[PDB]
From Swiss-Prot, chain G:
The lineage of its organism: Eukaryota, Viridiplantae, Streptophyta, Embryophyta, Tracheophyta. Residues 1-24 are annotated as: Disordered. Accessory subunit of the mitochondrial membrane respiratory chain NADH dehydrogenase (Complex I), that is believed not to be involved in catalysis. Complex I functions in the transfer of electrons from NADH to the respiratory chain. The immediate electron acceptor for the enzyme is believed to be ubiquinone. Keywords: Electron transport, Membrane, Mitochondrion, Mitochondrion inner membrane, Respiratory chain, Transport. GO terms for cellular component: cytosol; mitochondrial inner membrane; mitochondrial membrane; mitochondrion; respiratory chain complex I. It holds the Pfam family NDUFB10. This is NADH dehydrogenase [ubiquinone] 1 beta subcomplex subunit 10-B. It is found in: Mitochondrion inner membrane.
Swiss-Prot record, chain H:
Complex I is composed of at least 49 different subunits. The gene is ND5. This is NADH-ubiquinone oxidoreductase chain 5. Core subunit of the mitochondrial membrane respiratory chain NADH dehydrogenase (Complex I) that is believed to belong to the minimal assembly required for catalysis. Complex I functions in the transfer of electrons from NADH to the respiratory chain. The immediate electron acceptor for the enzyme is believed to be ubiquinone. Disulfide bonds: none annotated. Exons a and b (AtMg00513) and d and e (AtMg00060) are cis-spliced, while trans-splicing reactions are required to link exons b and c (AtMg00665) and c and d. It comes from Arabidopsis thaliana (Mouse-ear cress).
From Swiss-Prot, chain I:
Pfam families: Proton_antipo_M. It comes from the Eukaryota. GO terms for biological process: aerobic respiration; ATP synthesis coupled electron transport; electron transport coupled proton transport. It comes from Arabidopsis thaliana. Core subunit of the mitochondrial membrane respiratory chain NADH dehydrogenase (Complex I) that is believed to belong to the minimal assembly required for catalysis. Complex I functions in the transfer of electrons from NADH to the respiratory chain. The immediate electron acceptor for the enzyme is believed to be ubiquinone. Its EC number is 7.1.1.2. This is NADH-ubiquinone oxidoreductase chain 4. It catalyses: a ubiquinone + NADH + 5 H(+)(in) = a ubiquinol + NAD(+) + 4 H(+)(out).
From Swiss-Prot, chain J:
Complex I is composed of at least 49 different subunits. Disulfide bonds: none annotated. This is NADH dehydrogenase [ubiquinone] 1 beta subcomplex subunit 2. The keyword Lipid biosynthesis does not apply. It comes from Arabidopsis thaliana (Mouse-ear cress). One of its GO terms (cellular component) is respiratory chain complex I. Its main location: mitochondrion. Belongs to the complex I NDUFB2 subunit family. It is a peripheral membrane protein.
């Protein structure tokens, strides 16, 4: 009942599993990791915090510090 | 022209808002006629033509009023 | 379907056409009728129809709620 | 598969005529709560006559 | 890349046609006065 | 339609369990009774328990107190 | 034991509670919290009752619904202004 | 009467899909058509009772 | 009169009795384990019926003194929130015993002993009101799940999965423990009711809340540490893979709903935007990552991460809609993920592939499993009428009461969730068959076709009528959201 | 039916061509009758007695 499991598949499966051996901090990929690791979280954080600030501005209540 | 039979008599029939124009008085017998029949396009004709007469006369009144106002507006575009 | 005759195929195989399907069809109609009777009973039990009909409709033969919601102040 | 074709043929030859008066009859009582027609954006009466 | 310009160009035709409608000024050439209704244009009805 | 047809029995076996010989039971599985009785008890206790339990909650209490208070 | 009925609760606000120092008295905290939540739910159900009333209005109202139910609309909206735990408008009870 | 219109197709499909072996390749089709046809008949009844 | 203590003791009795008998009589071991699990399940259902949903105070409390001063003690007790978790964890265990029923002769009595110990320990976690001892039982699940993963796991990488799982729950756990000790020394007791009614320093709540979140951001798959779940979940047995995504992922959220939201209300407000950003980026990143996966297990392990992250958006949006939808989606996920992982387990136990490309066009061969898989991946879509929709839409509604940006990204999460869910469905059950490596294979037998029936009925019962579940919790949720909010 | 030099077609059924011809005739009659009655109405030749 077990599948034949032809040889030309497990190699690619392990390459997808063992991709951790291919990483050398290339500059283009360094920028790619940096932007999606920091900038997008920062951009969205500004988005939510300013959404709260604008919501509170209309009601007239003072803005929370939001540390 | 003006109103003759409006307000509570108009309110009794479920007259569509916007369909309550100046000569909407005869629309109420018309709408009982539509409910009386099974909404036949050809059975009831005499009562529909008077309402189209209402609307048609209103439409000429509006177009002639605007043609008049355009007539004075034509004098406005005169730079000596 | 050489192998497809071995699967159960809950809704029917490739081309089933059982030996006696007409009797199954008839019992299916009977079951549908029997199961939709309580649906009809429930539907006739709960139906407001706030406005009275202009002409006698095939309703109010099993529905008793007619003009029961023109009292829109004692509403929970 | 010919009877439904016949029914749709007999439909799309008289349904429009039998429904023109009874859905849009320049003030018909067919949309008491189904539709809300704004008095301002109500170009039905003036359309048929001023066009 | 060639197919991309058609989407911009095709939409450019519509906004260009949309610009033409702006330049035509259909709004101010009505042959009719604004509608008048009894009871203060149905103020109690609104 | 008019013809009766063929395929005396529907193809395949339910649950892939081969039918036993005539005159013998299905030889119920060793967990079959302990789990079927569990299902039966759960169904009945939910049917008669969730309905015979009093309808005490904060929605109905608030409903009664809103009806009694809105009149003043 | 059970009262086999509606869960009667004390309408009276609990005593010994001070807004300036709520945390001073812990034994009185929980019943004040329960009373506040119960009153909020009373307001919620009042809003729901008004919503049901306008629900049954709109069917009977017909085309000219504005004319004879406008008074109830304001009553329903003012209830929705101080609703429970909702939008930025937090009521001050 | 009015609850029926929406549940006849659902019930007919449910039985014709759970027990499609019993009704075969033609019984299921004819019974689904029957159920939807009576659904349309009650739809016409509702149209008369509501529209006119 | 059935109390809370008997429910806890039933798995203990089942485990102690099971050790007395030898291993030769394997049928007795499996029978007694299943019987104990089922009677525990029935007891849990009985506890549901006699649950007062009107009052806000806790239900049955059993106090067993721990320190000589009665300073801290086992304070058991359920409420609207903890009851359904107890029911779910009592319901999942018999399923766990039943899935590996065929291989019981290969596993042995250690397998059922471990699972019943897990049931006991997991029940003790949810229904207790002592903050410190809840921490003790909170990571007490390390040992039994470590045994379950390691002894019966992958081929040779089972060692690494155990180490990553055990390592991620050490630094954050003890960094939480430090806050536990500061709370104990500051106030004096760890009783939950006492700790709720305490004035914490404004600057102090930030540190304590951060310490709590650090140990809950590992159980809940947050952005920094969530890579353990895919690898340690593929390298796990099928019955160990159905509680790992069924209960353990609830500890972080339940811990947030118990010892984080009430005790630190203004700290929760001050840290609200940060959690929103983390959850939104987690949803988006996991959604984009899961659509290029070939592992048969991670494909839904990432779906579990996405659902758990979406839970926190409305869990931290203080609102009756948000929290109620949070627990409803939590139960819905506890059912649907369990069902999906059981489907993956039955697929793997026949063919033994752990890939996605091997399977294809098997609808003509296993129609029953095809329908069941379609219904489960259909519930994962969050259709109205299914379990996930009511809870998840309630979360969206509650968050949109507070904020208008982040939960729009949460809703954008499902614009791709449904897409890749149906795409994943169409990898396997659609297309022409490939009988080059699929020579012989069967459909579900009587056991695993009946095992899904509780899942089906619970799913539809969630979908069409969730009022009974919302009925028992609206008091507890409303009390939770209004705590420390005098005005 | 019959073949020309290698292609043969079944004769169209009597119950199909007859209904097709008759139904086309009746819809043509309906169109022409509608033209006779309200033709001037939609072409502005005469208004439906409303002015
Ligand atoms: C959250 C859920 C909300 C409710 C959603 C219900 C929608 C229906 C869900 C199931 C749809 C059917 C999809 C099943 C998988 C599709 C492929 C398949 O496996 O079909 C099966 C089964 O086919 C079925 O579809 C039967 C399932 C029932 C379908 C009808 C569902 C009716 C009940 C649901 C709706 C009830 C009303 C709403 C309830 C409140 C076998 O098909 P065969 O024709 O036998 O092909 C044979 C295979 N082979 C060629 C290889 C030999
Ligand atoms: C293949 C064969 C399958 C057979 C299944 C039954 C056949 C019918 C198939 C249709 C599917 C039915 C699924 C149940 C739908 C119930 C929908 C109505 C439920 C409901 O709202 O009414 C409640 C009834 O409770 C109840 O009594 C409901 C009892 C349902 C028991 C289901 C047991 C599922 C156990 C799963 C456990 C999972 C745990 C996960 C946490 C109480 O309504 P009320 O509030 O008004 O109170 C009443 C006070 N007078």
């Amino acid at each position: 009942m077990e599948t034949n499991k032809n040889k030309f598949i497990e190699d690619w499966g392990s390459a997808r599993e063992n991709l951790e051996h291919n990483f050398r901090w290339t500059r283009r990929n360094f920028a790619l990791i940096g932007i999606f690791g920091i900038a997008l979280p920062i951009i969205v954080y500004k988005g939510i915090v300013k959404d709260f600030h604008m919501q509170d501005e209309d009601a007239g209540r003072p803005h929370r510090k939001f540390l | 022209k003006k109103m003759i039979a409006t307000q509570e008599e108009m309110s009794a029939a479920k007259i569509a808002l916007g369909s309550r124009d100046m000569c909407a008085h005869l629309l109420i017998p018309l709408n009982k006629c539509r409910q009386a029949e099974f909404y036949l396009p050809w059975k009831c004709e005499d009562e529909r033509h008077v309402y189209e007469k209402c609307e048609y006369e209103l439409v000429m009144e509006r177009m002639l009023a605007m043609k008049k106002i355009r007539e004075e507006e034509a004098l406005a575009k005169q730079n000596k | 379907g050489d192998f497809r005759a071995k699967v159960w195929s809950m809704t029917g195989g490739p081309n089933c056409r059982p030996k006696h399907w007409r009797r199954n069809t008839a019992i299916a109609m009977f079951g549908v009728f029997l199961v939709c009777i309580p649906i009809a009973k429930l539907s006739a039990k709960l139906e407001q129809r706030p406005h009275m009909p202009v002409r006698p409709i095939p309703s109010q033969i099993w529905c008793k709620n007619f003009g029961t919601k023109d009292d829109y102040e004692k509403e929970h | 598969m010919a009877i439904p074709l016949i029914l749709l043929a007999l439909g799309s030859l008289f349904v429009g005529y039998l429904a023109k008066d009874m859905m849009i009859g320049l003030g018909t009582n067919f949309w008491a709560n189904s539709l809300l027609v704004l008095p301002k954006n109500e170009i039905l009466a003036e359309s048929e006559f001023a066009a | 890349y060639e197919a991309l310009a058609w989407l911009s160009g095709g939409l450019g035709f519509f906004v260009g046609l949309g610009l033409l409608a702006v330049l035509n000024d259909k709004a101010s050439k009505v042959p009719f006065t604004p509608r008048v209704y009894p009871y203060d244009n149905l103020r109690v009805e609104l | 339609w008019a013809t009766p047809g063929h395929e005396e029995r529907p193809k395949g076996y339910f649950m892939n369990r081969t039918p036993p010989a005539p005159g013998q039971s299905r030889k119920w599985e060793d967990w079959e009774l302990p789990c079927y009785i569990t299902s039966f008890l759960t169904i009945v206790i939910l049917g008669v328990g969730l309905n015979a339990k009093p309808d005490l909650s904060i929605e109905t209490w608030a409903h009664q107190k809103a009806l009694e208070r809105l009149e003043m | 034991g059970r009262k086999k009925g509606l869960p009667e609760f004390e309408e009276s606000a609990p005593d010994g509670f001070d807004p300036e120092n709520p945390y001073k008295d812990p034994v009185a905290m929980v019943e004040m919290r329960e009373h506040i939540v119960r009153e909020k739910w009373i307001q919620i159900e009042k809003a729901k009752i008004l919503r049901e009333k306008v629900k049954w209005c709109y069917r009977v109202e017909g085309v000219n619904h504005y004319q004879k139910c406008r008074h109830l609309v304001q009553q329903y909206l003012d209830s929705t202004r101080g609703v429970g735990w909702g939008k930025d408008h937090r009521p001050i009870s | 009467m009015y609850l029926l219109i929406v549940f006849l197709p659902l019930l007919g499909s449910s039985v014709a899909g759970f027990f499609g072996r019993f009704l075969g390749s033609e019984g299921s089709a004819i019974m689904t058509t029957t159920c939807v046809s009576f659904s349309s008949i009650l739809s016409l009844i509702a149209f008369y009772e509501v529209a006119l | 009169y059935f109390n809370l203590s008997g429910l806890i003791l039933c798995p203990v009795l089942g485990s102690i009795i099971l050790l007395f008998i030898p291993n030769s009589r394997i049928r007795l071991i499996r029978l007694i384990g299943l019987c104990a699990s089922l009677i525990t399940f029935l007891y849990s259902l009985v506890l549901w019926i006699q649950f007062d949903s009107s009052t806000a105070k806790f239900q049955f409390v059993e106090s067993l003194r721990w320190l000589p001063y009665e300073n801290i003690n086992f304070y058991l007790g359920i409420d609207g929130i903890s009851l359904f978790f107890v029911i779910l964890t009592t319901f999942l265990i018999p399923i766990c015993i039943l899935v590996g029923w065929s291989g019981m002769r290969s596993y042995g009595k250690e397998y059922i002993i471990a699972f019943l110990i897990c049931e006991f320990l997991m029940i003790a976690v949810f229904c207790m009101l002592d903050l410190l001892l809840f921490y003790v039982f909170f990571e007490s699940v390390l040992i039994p799940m470590f045994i379950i993963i390691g002894v019966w796991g992958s081929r040779q990488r089972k060692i690494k999965a155990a180490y990553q799982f055990f390592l991620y729950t050490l630094l954050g756990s003890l960094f939480m423990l430090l806050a536990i000790l500061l709370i104990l020394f500051q106030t004096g007791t760890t009783d939950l009711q006492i700790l709720l009614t305490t004035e914490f320093s404004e600057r102090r709540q930030i540190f304590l809340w951060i310490a709590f979140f650090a140990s809950f951001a590992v159980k809940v798959p947050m952005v920094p540490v969530h890579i353990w779940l895919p690898e340690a979940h593929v390298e796990a047995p099928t019955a160990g893979s159905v509680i790992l995504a069924g209960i353990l992922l609830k500890f972080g959220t339940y811990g947030f709903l118990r010892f984080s939201i009430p005790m630190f209300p203004e700290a929760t407000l001050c840290f609200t935007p940060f959690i929103y950003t983390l959850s939104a980026i987690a949803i988006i990143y996991t959604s984009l990552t899961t659509l290029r996966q070939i592992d048969l297990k991670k494909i839904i392990a990432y779906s579990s991460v996405a659902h758990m992250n979406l839970v926190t958006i409305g869990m931290f949006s203080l609102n009756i809609q948000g929290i109620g939808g949070s627990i409803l989606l939590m139960l819905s996920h506890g059912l649907v993920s369990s069902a999906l992982f059981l489907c993956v387990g039955v697929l793997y136990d026949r063919h033994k592939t752990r890939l996605v490309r091997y399977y294809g066009g098997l609808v003509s061969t296993m129609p029953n499993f095809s329908t069941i898989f379609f219904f489960f991946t259909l519930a994962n879509m969050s259709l109205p009428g299914t379990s996930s929709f009511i809870g998840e839409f309630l979360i969206l509604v509650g968050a949109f009461q507070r904020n208008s940006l982040v939960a729009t990204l949460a809703a954008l999460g499902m614009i791709l969730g449904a897409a890749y869910s149906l795409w994943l469905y169409n990898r396997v059950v659609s297309g022409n068959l490939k009988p080059d490596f699929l020579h012989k294979f069967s459909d579900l037998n009587g056991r695993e076709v009946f095992i899904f029936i509780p899942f089906l009925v619970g799913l539809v019962w969630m979908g069409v009528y969730p009022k009974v579940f919302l009925d028992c919790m609206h008091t507890s949720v409303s009390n939770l959201v209004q705590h420390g909010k005098f005005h | 039916g019959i073949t020309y030099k290698g292609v043969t077609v079944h004769t169209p059924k009597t119950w199909h061509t007859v209904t097709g011809k008759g139904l086309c005739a009746v819809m043509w009659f309906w169109i022409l009758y509608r033209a006779k009655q309200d033709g001037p109405v939609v072409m502005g030749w005469r208004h439906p007695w409303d002015g």
